[PDB]
Protein backbone atom coordinates (compact mmCIF):
# COMPACT_ATOMS: atom_id res chain seq x y z
CA UNK A 1 0.00 0.00 0.00
CA UNK A 2 2.78 2.46 -0.89
CA UNK A 3 0.65 5.61 -0.71
CA UNK A 4 0.97 9.12 0.73
CA UNK A 5 4.48 10.36 -0.09
CA UNK A 6 7.00 7.97 1.54
CA UNK A 7 7.40 4.49 3.10
CA UNK A 8 7.73 1.07 1.41
CA UNK A 9 11.29 1.16 0.06
CA UNK A 10 12.09 -1.20 2.93
CA UNK A 11 11.31 -4.41 1.11
CA UNK A 12 12.92 -3.41 -2.15
CA UNK A 13 16.04 -2.60 -0.13
CA UNK A 14 16.43 -6.08 1.26
CA UNK A 15 16.65 -8.05 -1.99
CA UNK A 16 19.23 -5.53 -3.22
CA UNK A 17 21.18 -5.36 0.03
CA UNK A 18 21.19 -9.20 0.14
CA UNK A 19 21.75 -10.11 -3.52
CA UNK A 20 24.75 -12.44 -3.77
CA UNK A 21 27.88 -11.23 -5.49
CA UNK A 22 29.87 -12.81 -8.32
CA UNK A 23 30.57 -16.54 -8.37
CA UNK A 24 33.41 -18.41 -10.06
CA UNK A 25 33.11 -22.01 -11.21
CA UNK A 26 36.79 -22.86 -11.34
CA UNK A 27 36.90 -23.93 -14.99
CA UNK A 28 40.19 -23.27 -16.79
CA UNK A 29 39.06 -22.18 -20.24
CA UNK A 30 42.62 -22.70 -21.44
CA UNK A 31 41.79 -26.38 -22.05
CA UNK A 32 40.17 -28.41 -24.88
CA UNK A 33 36.39 -28.22 -24.47
CA UNK A 34 35.20 -31.71 -23.66
CA UNK A 35 31.88 -32.98 -22.37
CA UNK A 36 33.77 -34.02 -19.23
CA UNK A 37 35.51 -30.83 -18.15
CA UNK A 38 32.43 -28.81 -19.13
CA UNK A 39 29.63 -30.62 -17.31
CA UNK A 40 32.03 -31.31 -14.45
CA UNK A 41 32.58 -27.55 -14.16
CA UNK A 42 28.89 -26.66 -14.26
CA UNK A 43 28.49 -29.23 -11.53
CA UNK A 44 31.16 -27.53 -9.44
CA UNK A 45 29.39 -24.26 -10.13
CA UNK A 46 26.11 -25.67 -8.90
CA UNK A 47 27.54 -26.49 -5.47
CA UNK A 48 29.23 -23.10 -5.30
CA UNK A 49 25.91 -21.54 -6.16
CA UNK A 50 23.96 -23.52 -3.58
CA UNK A 51 25.74 -22.07 -0.54
CA UNK A 52 24.99 -18.50 -1.60
CA UNK A 53 21.38 -19.28 -2.28
CA UNK A 54 21.26 -20.73 1.20
CA UNK A 55 22.61 -17.63 2.85
CA UNK A 56 20.61 -15.55 0.40
CA UNK A 57 17.37 -17.33 1.38
CA UNK A 58 17.92 -17.12 5.17
CA UNK A 59 18.17 -13.36 4.72
CA UNK A 60 14.80 -13.15 2.95
CA UNK A 61 12.01 -11.39 4.88
CA UNK A 62 9.86 -13.70 6.94
CA UNK A 63 11.77 -16.61 5.49
CA UNK A 64 13.02 -17.49 8.97
CA UNK A 65 9.45 -17.93 10.15
CA UNK A 66 9.38 -21.09 8.03
CA UNK A 67 9.94 -24.52 9.52
CA UNK A 68 13.47 -25.86 9.30
CA UNK A 69 12.75 -29.04 7.37
CA UNK A 70 10.57 -26.90 5.17
CA UNK A 71 13.26 -24.31 4.54
CA UNK A 72 15.66 -27.11 3.75
CA UNK A 73 13.01 -28.69 1.58
CA UNK A 74 11.87 -25.68 -0.42
CA UNK A 75 15.44 -24.61 -1.08
CA UNK A 76 16.20 -28.16 -2.17
CA UNK A 77 13.56 -27.84 -4.87
CA UNK A 78 13.34 -24.45 -6.55
CA UNK A 79 17.15 -24.22 -6.43
CA UNK A 80 17.28 -25.21 -10.07
CA UNK A 81 14.67 -22.67 -11.11
CA UNK A 82 16.41 -19.87 -9.28
CA UNK A 83 19.91 -20.40 -10.63
CA UNK A 84 18.58 -20.57 -14.13
CA UNK A 85 16.83 -17.26 -13.61
CA UNK A 86 19.84 -15.58 -11.99
CA UNK A 87 22.04 -16.89 -14.77
CA UNK A 88 19.50 -15.50 -17.21
CA UNK A 89 19.75 -12.09 -15.61
CA UNK A 90 23.53 -12.34 -15.93
CA UNK A 91 23.62 -13.26 -19.61
CA UNK A 92 21.31 -10.32 -20.23
CA UNK A 93 23.02 -7.38 -18.53
CA UNK A 94 26.35 -8.83 -19.65
CA UNK A 95 26.62 -10.56 -23.04
CA UNK A 96 23.36 -8.86 -24.01
CA UNK A 97 21.47 -12.12 -24.52
CA UNK A 98 23.72 -14.02 -26.90
CA UNK A 99 25.89 -16.24 -24.71
CA UNK A 100 25.14 -18.27 -21.59
CA UNK A 101 27.06 -16.38 -18.93
CA UNK A 102 27.14 -19.02 -16.17
CA UNK A 103 30.22 -17.53 -14.46
CA UNK A 104 33.11 -15.15 -15.20
CA UNK A 105 35.32 -18.18 -15.99
CA UNK A 106 32.56 -20.05 -17.76
CA UNK A 107 30.85 -18.43 -20.78
CA UNK A 108 28.82 -20.82 -22.86
CA UNK A 109 29.21 -20.02 -26.53
CA UNK A 110 27.49 -21.88 -29.37
CA UNK A 111 30.30 -24.40 -29.58
CA UNK A 112 30.24 -25.37 -25.89
CA UNK A 113 26.44 -25.46 -25.88
CA UNK A 114 26.86 -28.34 -28.28
CA UNK A 115 29.74 -30.11 -26.58
CA UNK A 116 27.73 -29.94 -23.33
CA UNK A 117 25.54 -32.68 -24.80
CA UNK A 118 22.67 -30.34 -24.01
CA UNK A 119 22.26 -27.74 -26.73
CA UNK A 120 18.47 -28.09 -26.65
CA UNK A 121 17.86 -26.83 -23.12
CA UNK A 122 20.58 -24.21 -23.57
CA UNK A 123 18.41 -22.61 -26.20
CA UNK A 124 15.50 -22.43 -23.77
CA UNK A 125 17.75 -20.72 -21.22
CA UNK A 126 19.02 -18.42 -23.92
CA UNK A 127 15.38 -17.70 -24.66
CA UNK A 128 14.28 -16.84 -21.16
CA UNK A 129 17.29 -14.56 -21.28
CA UNK A 130 16.39 -12.67 -24.43
CA UNK A 131 12.94 -12.25 -22.84
CA UNK A 132 14.35 -9.96 -20.15
CA UNK A 133 15.17 -7.49 -22.89
CA UNK A 134 11.86 -7.70 -24.72
CA UNK A 135 9.75 -7.42 -21.55
CA UNK A 136 12.19 -4.75 -20.42
CA UNK A 137 12.51 -6.45 -17.05
CA UNK A 138 13.83 -3.98 -14.47
CA UNK A 139 16.33 -4.84 -11.71
CA UNK A 140 13.73 -4.34 -8.98
CA UNK A 141 11.32 -6.52 -10.89
CA UNK A 142 13.98 -9.22 -11.20
CA UNK A 143 15.21 -9.19 -7.60
CA UNK A 144 11.58 -9.53 -6.57
CA UNK A 145 10.66 -12.19 -9.09
CA UNK A 146 13.70 -14.31 -8.32
CA UNK A 147 12.55 -14.43 -4.70
CA UNK A 148 9.00 -15.45 -5.55
CA UNK A 149 10.50 -18.33 -7.53
CA UNK A 150 11.86 -19.74 -4.29
CA UNK A 151 8.34 -20.54 -3.13
CA UNK A 152 7.24 -21.72 -6.53
CA UNK A 153 7.53 -25.48 -6.19
CA UNK A 154 6.15 -27.71 -3.44
CA UNK A 155 5.04 -31.33 -2.99
CA UNK A 156 1.30 -31.75 -3.65
CA UNK A 157 1.35 -33.70 -0.37
CA UNK A 158 1.96 -30.42 1.46
CA UNK A 159 4.81 -29.07 3.58
CA UNK A 160 5.17 -29.65 7.31
CA UNK A 161 3.18 -26.46 7.88
CA UNK A 162 1.35 -25.23 4.81
CA UNK A 163 -0.17 -22.09 6.40
CA UNK A 164 3.05 -20.17 7.08
CA UNK A 165 4.15 -20.95 3.52
CA UNK A 166 1.03 -19.83 1.69
CA UNK A 167 1.08 -16.72 3.84
CA UNK A 168 4.56 -15.76 2.77
CA UNK A 169 4.10 -16.76 -0.85
CA UNK A 170 1.11 -14.54 -0.56
CA UNK A 171 2.88 -11.54 0.90
CA UNK A 172 5.58 -11.84 -1.71
CA UNK A 173 3.25 -11.80 -4.71
CA UNK A 174 2.00 -8.47 -3.34
CA UNK A 175 5.41 -6.90 -3.20
CA UNK A 176 5.81 -7.90 -6.85
CA UNK A 177 2.47 -6.21 -7.42
CA UNK A 178 3.62 -3.29 -5.28
CA UNK A 179 6.72 -2.81 -7.41
CA UNK A 180 4.80 -3.12 -10.67
CA UNK A 181 2.40 -0.52 -9.36
CA UNK A 182 5.00 2.27 -9.12
CA UNK A 183 5.19 4.33 -12.32
CA UNK A 184 1.63 5.57 -12.88
CA UNK A 185 -1.86 5.18 -11.37
CA UNK A 186 -4.17 3.18 -13.64
CA UNK A 187 -5.48 -0.40 -12.97
CA UNK A 188 -5.09 -1.21 -16.67
CA UNK A 189 -1.42 -1.53 -17.69
CA UNK A 190 -0.90 -2.97 -14.21
CA UNK A 191 -3.26 -5.89 -14.86
CA UNK A 192 -1.22 -6.10 -18.06
CA UNK A 193 2.34 -5.87 -16.74
CA UNK A 194 1.46 -8.29 -13.92
CA UNK A 195 0.08 -10.78 -16.42
CA UNK A 196 3.37 -10.57 -18.31
CA UNK A 197 5.76 -11.30 -15.51
CA UNK A 198 3.56 -14.02 -14.07
CA UNK A 199 3.80 -15.71 -17.46
CA UNK A 200 7.53 -15.30 -17.54
CA UNK A 201 7.80 -16.83 -14.07
CA UNK A 202 5.77 -19.92 -15.03
CA UNK A 203 7.78 -20.24 -18.21
CA UNK A 204 10.72 -21.03 -15.92
CA UNK A 205 9.17 -24.22 -14.59
CA UNK A 206 9.38 -26.01 -17.97
CA UNK A 207 13.08 -25.37 -18.40
CA UNK A 208 13.77 -26.36 -14.78
CA UNK A 209 11.67 -29.43 -15.27
CA UNK A 210 13.84 -30.12 -18.30
CA UNK A 211 17.19 -29.31 -16.81
CA UNK A 212 16.21 -31.74 -14.09
CA UNK A 213 15.77 -34.87 -16.19
CA UNK A 214 19.20 -34.22 -17.72
CA UNK A 215 21.16 -33.89 -14.49
CA UNK A 216 19.42 -36.89 -12.95
CA UNK A 217 20.22 -39.11 -15.91
CA UNK A 218 23.70 -37.66 -15.87
CA UNK A 219 23.98 -38.79 -12.27
CA UNK A 220 23.14 -42.34 -13.35
CA UNK A 221 25.65 -42.70 -16.17
CA UNK A 222 27.85 -40.44 -14.07
CA UNK A 223 30.92 -42.65 -13.48
CA UNK A 224 30.62 -43.84 -17.05
CA UNK A 225 31.05 -40.48 -18.75
CA UNK A 226 33.52 -39.80 -15.95
CA UNK A 227 31.93 -36.68 -14.47
CA UNK A 228 32.55 -35.80 -10.83
CA UNK A 229 29.67 -34.87 -8.52
CA UNK A 230 29.93 -32.67 -5.43
CA UNK A 231 28.96 -34.37 -2.17
CA UNK A 232 25.98 -32.08 -1.83
CA UNK A 233 25.02 -32.09 -5.51
CA UNK A 234 24.49 -35.79 -5.94
CA UNK A 235 22.40 -35.74 -2.76
CA UNK A 236 19.55 -33.53 -3.98
CA UNK A 237 19.55 -35.00 -7.46
CA UNK A 238 19.17 -38.51 -6.05
CA UNK A 239 16.42 -37.70 -3.60
CA UNK A 240 14.90 -34.27 -3.90
CA UNK A 241 15.01 -34.12 -7.70
CA UNK A 242 13.51 -37.59 -8.19
CA UNK A 243 10.40 -36.41 -6.31
CA UNK A 244 9.84 -33.69 -8.91
CA UNK A 245 10.09 -36.41 -11.56
CA UNK A 246 7.99 -39.00 -9.69
CA UNK A 247 5.31 -36.30 -9.70
CA UNK A 248 5.14 -36.18 -5.87
CA UNK A 249 6.37 -32.57 -5.94
CA UNK A 250 4.83 -30.08 -8.37
CA UNK A 251 5.44 -26.43 -9.37
CA UNK A 252 3.00 -23.57 -8.72
CA UNK A 253 1.82 -21.93 -11.92
CA UNK A 254 -0.15 -18.72 -11.77
CA UNK A 255 -2.05 -19.53 -14.98
CA UNK A 256 -2.55 -22.89 -16.66
Amino acid sequence: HIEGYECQPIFLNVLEAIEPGVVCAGHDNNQPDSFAALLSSLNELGERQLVHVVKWAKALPGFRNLHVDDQMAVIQYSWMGLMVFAMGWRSFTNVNSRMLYFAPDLVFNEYRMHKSRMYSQCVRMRHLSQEFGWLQITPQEFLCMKALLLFSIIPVDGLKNQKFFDELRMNYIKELDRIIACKRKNPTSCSRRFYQLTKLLDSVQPIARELHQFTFDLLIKSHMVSVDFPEMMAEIISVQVPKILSGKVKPIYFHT
Binding site: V54, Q76, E235
Partner: peptide
Protein backbone atom coordinates in the same frame (compact mmCIF):
# COMPACT_ATOMS: atom_id res chain seq x y z
CA UNK B 1 19.81 -34.47 3.44
CA UNK B 2 22.61 -33.95 5.99
CA UNK B 3 25.49 -31.73 4.84
CA UNK B 4 23.19 -28.81 4.04
CA UNK B 5 20.95 -28.46 7.09
CA UNK B 6 24.08 -27.23 8.87
CA UNK B 7 24.27 -24.05 6.81
CA UNK B 8 20.68 -23.24 7.79
CA UNK B 9 21.99 -22.67 11.33
Amino acid sequence: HKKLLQLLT
